[PDB]
Design a protein around this ligand. Structure first.
Ligand SMILES: [Mg+2]
Ligand SMILES: [Mg+2]
Ligand SMILES: [Mg+2]
Ligand SMILES: [Mg+2]
Ligand SMILES: [Mg+2]
Ligand SMILES: [Mg+2]
Ligand SMILES: [Mg+2]
Ligand SMILES: [Mg+2]
Ligand SMILES: [Mg+2]
Ligand SMILES: [Mg+2]
Lengths: 82, 145, 63, 100, 141, 143, 206
RNA sequence: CGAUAACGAACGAGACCUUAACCUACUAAAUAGUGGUGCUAGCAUUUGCUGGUUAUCCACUUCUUAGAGGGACUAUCGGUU
RNA sequence: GAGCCAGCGAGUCUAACCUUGGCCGAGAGGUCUUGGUAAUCUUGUGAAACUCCGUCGUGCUGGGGAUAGAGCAUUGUAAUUAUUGCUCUUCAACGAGGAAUUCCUAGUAAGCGCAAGUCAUCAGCUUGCGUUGAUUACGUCCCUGCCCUUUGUACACACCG
């Protein structure tokens, strides 16, 4: 059963699924000093899912942490309040 | 808008119908790990149980998931329209079933055994392991075993 | 680090085995009245500006 | 009275001078008329293989048939209606009259 | 009666007929305003003819465009050609020829297909391939 | 100036009019809702389960306002999509007939749409009187 | 600028754009001077467009693509790897989001970031295939400025594509970061990495 | 084209025919389509906006259709042989 | 979920084809009437890709839907080696593919559907038609074919001589 490929796996990190106190103030304290805020940066620096990233993004934009540039679906583009 | 502090009751694993359902996903997609329930059915039970479908599997209350499993195991008594069940109008009992987890595997072997026992054509095709739905076999499924 | 910009004044013709390479005669922007023949890979017309990465070389043809 | 002449041939040059001779003979008898409405020409296409057997290169072939259809509406007492349709019948051109 | 002209813009199969008459200045596309044309990106494409010449030449005329045929992005280009030609037709008939030429030049400098229809037509499909140029597959063994 | 249904974006007017439906609470929703999936080519039932009859009703209300008359056969073609036929190529497949016929019956009860001569359903003058009024209401939201 | 009103209300931010300058969806085409004197006359700027979707016919003659705007050519290379063929409205949305990202991430103008990016990722000298007999030989030749622009757009977009594939990052935010990384010039951009790789093989064969 | 013991033609290529693109130029049309005027609906209210209507009828051909025709011949200019 | 736009075409009478609209049914379908021998009716063939908002969140995963089990219908004298359609359930390989190799120069390639042909029923096929629409080149004889010139010939059913 020769296959003529190699087929190595990957590391498959465990990004957080429900949000708790240690994640909550961590997003509260470091969404400033982010020049550009989106779903994918929040996944990479905070280890939360796209679910949490999209809902938290909606959360901040009414109360005040991040300013919007563009509110198109599947791509949210956010800047800092200086 | 709604951020919510999840608490210490949470479960990374849960057991319904003798299967290790993984947590950390939405409840309807999570219960599809249990055999005999697929995405359509899973939506209807959690709808008939009046649960918030937005929740993850690991955070749902103890009474709610036992309420869910009752609606799965007595479906048509709780107003499921019963053409929605998989094994309806059964060959001995006459009544509409809905096999779950082990029943699906065990009852599937049994009705195979009738066609093998009466020597029906489909049963003899299963005993050889060939196709039974009238497919061509001259090229396809070549390295099946 | 040296590069020389060079303005093409007369395209000569196609060279190379497949035909994808052109002989051109280029004039240097600074130090004009120096003429050389070089090879170009892509589409070229006249009055284009090449960046010769080194100027002390001349090809004639590709065999 | 509202009679209507309809032409449905496939030969265009036979059809036109039939239609022109209807409308010109109308005007000696000085009748008011809807001048010829030309409906969209419809092409009957049949795409077959050239070969009788199934060998060679797969060359297809499209035979087509164009059908041209015109109608002229007329109002006239009976004697002109008997005269106009009795004459100017050209072969391969189909003429039929409907009233009202 | 009332000063009015009638033009059309085209694209591959889309045709948009435009009635240009003298009015108060409203520019409607299929009974709906010009700001409602659904594909959000190319809405900013249909603003550009009036955005080129300035909105001042659209105060005293009102525009109706009726759109049929083709597809979504083809319908957009037929709309913009119809209003550009309709404006240049209005200044041809009523206003002097000086206003026509400054109108025409600004259009024709920016994009030529605002006034001239694109002549690119579909190429017939040929037996032996899925397309007009493509063939299906040659195999030798 | 006499603002109308044509003068407002399709998305937000349908959303605003459907919310008018949810508050009014008088629609005669069928009863098989949240069991059906509303198209034979569809793969799931509507994710927004607690409405989507009100969404569909607002959607169908604007269509008779635009057009002259519709039937239920037209609406199944409009709301149908491509059915992924497994390993075969896709195909247009019509939507669930009951869903269109019942909401058209349901809109008859509130008095928006009526029967038409020449067949089909026509917007009544009650329908042509309140759809404008939400259209006035929904278009000053951003102003 | 005086705002003119008429029977159909036209929004005021698009109304400003009419007389003032005929700039892009948000950015201006002034101060967008290309730096390199070879790559000018082959990037087509200073004739501004509103939208990056022009249904133009540039393929008839040999150099008409050099008159096509460089933002249009950037969109055109995005509709690739087969499943995305056609889909230009998909391409010009992505380019709009990419330009927004570049402006938020560095304050400097987005299209100026794009124009010096392609000047960095034009390969200046490149190799060709002479036979030599059995073992295929290399000969270093020079590149056209048109080919340099052509190569640059392809090199930039392939890197965005392979990086935004099977990965949480969307293609727009990927497309920005190599465009930034190339325009500064880093050798961590795929387009810069490929560019120096061609020149070293050319340097090997003189 | 040129050279030139060859001159001048024929078939094939080309021409031809079909089709697609242009025509506010002609001839015409509720089985194509506008605009009005009747009859109405809704919203405004100024002098408007959007619809519905087949016996309201009067005119129209831009768009739709096909008859006859026109139009492109690489025209004009520049470069190079 | 919402928006929402083509073109090529086919269609029954001494027959029962294209089917609008109303009603029943989750569906596939059933039933009562109607229009059409057709620029008139199906039919604006409201096609799909697409567009806008939402759930998913790099997980062989809500990717993929093969292979199996039960029922409900339709065509037909008849459907078991399941005709086809619908529901529910089961939910495999496959993580872009070695040597090799095909097609293609602008409304073209490629994506996406629809009609027609075969057709009582059955399209993953073909012939056409539209929709969305690139990159690259505007060369050469390097490879593979074909043509021509010069040349040698003891060949001429002509080098398989
Ligand atoms: Mg054969
Ligand atoms: Mg109406
Ligand atoms: Mg991505
Ligand atoms: Mg020249
Ligand atoms: Mg169709
Ligand atoms: Mg199985
Ligand atoms: Mg090869
Ligand atoms: Mg295809
Ligand atoms: Mg010898
Ligand atoms: Mg001999």
């Amino acid at each position: 059963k020769k296959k003529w490929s190699k087929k190595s796996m990957k590391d498959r990190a465990q990004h957080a699924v429900i949000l708790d106190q240690e994640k909550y103030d961590r997003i509260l304290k470091e969404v400033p000093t982010y020049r550009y805020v989106s779903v994918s940066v929040l996944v990479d620096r905070l280890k939360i899912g796209g679910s949490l990233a999209r809902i938290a993004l909606r959360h901040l934009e009414k109360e005040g942490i991040i300013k919007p540039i563009s509110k198109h679906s599947k791509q949210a583009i956010y800047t800092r309040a200086t | 808008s709604l951020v919510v502090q999840e608490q210490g009751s949470f479960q990374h694993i849960l057991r319904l119908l003798n299967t290790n359902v993984d947590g950390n996903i939405k409840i309807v997609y999570a219960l599809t790990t249990i055999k005999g329930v697929g995405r359509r059915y899973s939506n209807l039970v959690c709808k008939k149980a009046d649960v918030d479908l937005h929740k993850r599997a690991g955070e749902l209350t103890q009474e709610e998931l036992e309420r869910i499993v009752q609606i799965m195991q007595n479906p048509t008594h709780y107003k499921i329209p019963a053409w929605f069940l998989n094994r309806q109008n059964d060959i001995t009992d006459g009544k509409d079933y809905h096999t779950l987890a082990n029943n699906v595997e065990s009852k599937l072997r049994d009705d195979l055994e009738r066609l093998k026992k009466i020597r029906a054509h489909r049963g003899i095709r299963h005993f050889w392991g060939l196709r039974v739905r009238g497919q061509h076999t001259k090229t396809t499924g070549r390295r099946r075993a | 680090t040296p590069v020389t910009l060079a303005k093409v004044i007369k395209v000569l013709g196609r060279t190379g085995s497949r035909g994808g390479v052109t002989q051109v005669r280029v004039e240097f922007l600074e130090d004009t009245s120096r003429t050389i023949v070089r090879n170009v890979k892509g589409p070229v017309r006249e009055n284009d500006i090449l960046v010769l990465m080194e100027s002390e070389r001349e090809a004639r043809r590709l065999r | 009275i509202k009679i209507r002449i309809t032409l449905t041939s496939t030969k265009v040059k036979q059809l036109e001078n039939v239609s022109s001779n209807i409308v010109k003979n109308a005007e000696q008898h000085n009748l008011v008329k809807k001048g010829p409405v030309r409906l969209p020409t419809k092409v009957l296409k049949i795409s077959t293989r050239k070969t009788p057997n199934g060998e060679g290169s797969k060359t297809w072939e499209t035979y087509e048939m164009r059908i041209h259809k015109r109608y002229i509406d007329l109002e006239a007492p009976v004697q002109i209606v008997k005269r106009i349709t009795q004459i100017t019948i050209e072969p391969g051109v189909d003429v039929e009259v409907v009233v009202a | 009666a009332v000063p009015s002209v009638q033009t059309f813009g085209k694209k591959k199969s889309a045709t948009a007929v435009a009635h240009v008459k003298a009015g108060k200045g409203l520019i409607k596309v299929n009974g709906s305003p010009i700001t409602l044309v659904e594909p959000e990106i190319l809405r900013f494409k249909v603003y550009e003819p009036l955005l080129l010449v300035g909105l001042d030449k659209f105060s005293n005329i009102d525009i109706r465009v009726r759109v049929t045929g083709g597809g979504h992005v083809s319908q957009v280009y037929a709309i913009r050609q119809a209003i550009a030609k309709g404006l240049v037709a209005y200044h041809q008939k009523y206003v002097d020829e000086q206003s026509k030429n400054e109108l025409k030049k600004a259009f024709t400098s920016y994009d030529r297909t605002l006034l001239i229809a694109d002549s690119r037509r579909p190429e017939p499909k040929k037996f032996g391939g899925k397309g007009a140029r493509s063939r299906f597959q040659k195999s030798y063994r | 100036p006499g603002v109308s249904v044509r003068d407002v974006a399709a998305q937000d007017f349908i959303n605003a009019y459907a919310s008018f439906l949810q508050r009014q609470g008088k629609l005669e929703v069928p009863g098989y809702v949240d069991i059906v999936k509303t198209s034979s080519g569809n793969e799931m039932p509507p994710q927004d389960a607690e409405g989507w009859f009100y969404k569909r009703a607002a959607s169908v209300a604007r269509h008779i306002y635009m057009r002259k008359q519709v039937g239920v056969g037209k609406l199944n073609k409009l709301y149908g999509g491509a059915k992924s036929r497994g390993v075969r190529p896709y195909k247009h497949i019509d939507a669930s007939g009951s869903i269109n016929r019942k909401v058209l019956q349901a809109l008859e009860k509130i008095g928006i749409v009526e029967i038409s001569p020449k067949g089909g359903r026509r917007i009544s003058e009650n329908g042509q009187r309140d759809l404008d009024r939400i259209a006035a209401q929904t278009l000053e939201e951003d102003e | 600028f005086t705002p003119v009103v008429l029977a159909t209300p036209i929004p005021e931010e698009v109304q400003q754009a009419q007389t003032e300058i005929k700039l892009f969806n948000k950015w201006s085409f002034e101060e967008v001077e290309v730096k390199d004197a070879s790559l000018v006359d082959y990037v087509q700027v200073r004739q501004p467009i509103f939208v990056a979707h022009t249904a133009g016919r540039y393929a008839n003659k040999r150099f008409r693509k050099a008159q096509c705007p460089i933002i249009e050519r950037l969109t055109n290379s995005l509709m690739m790897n087969g499943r995305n063929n056609g889909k230009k409205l998909k391409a010009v949305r992505i380019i709009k989001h990419t330009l927004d990202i570049i402006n938020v991430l560095t304050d400097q103008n987005p299209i100026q970031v794009v124009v010096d990016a392609i000047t960095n990722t034009g390969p200046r000298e490149d190799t060709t295939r002479v036979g030599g007999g059995g073992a295929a030989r290399r000969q270093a030749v020079d590149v056209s400025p048109l080919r340099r622009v052509n190569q640059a757009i392809a090199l930039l977009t392939i890197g965005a594509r392979e990086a935004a594939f099977r990965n949480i990052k969307t293609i727009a935010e990927t497309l920005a970061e190599e465009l930034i990384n190339a325009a500064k010039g880093s050798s961590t951009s795929y387009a810069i990495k490929k560019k120096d790789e061609l020149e070293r093989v050319a340097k090997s064969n003189r």
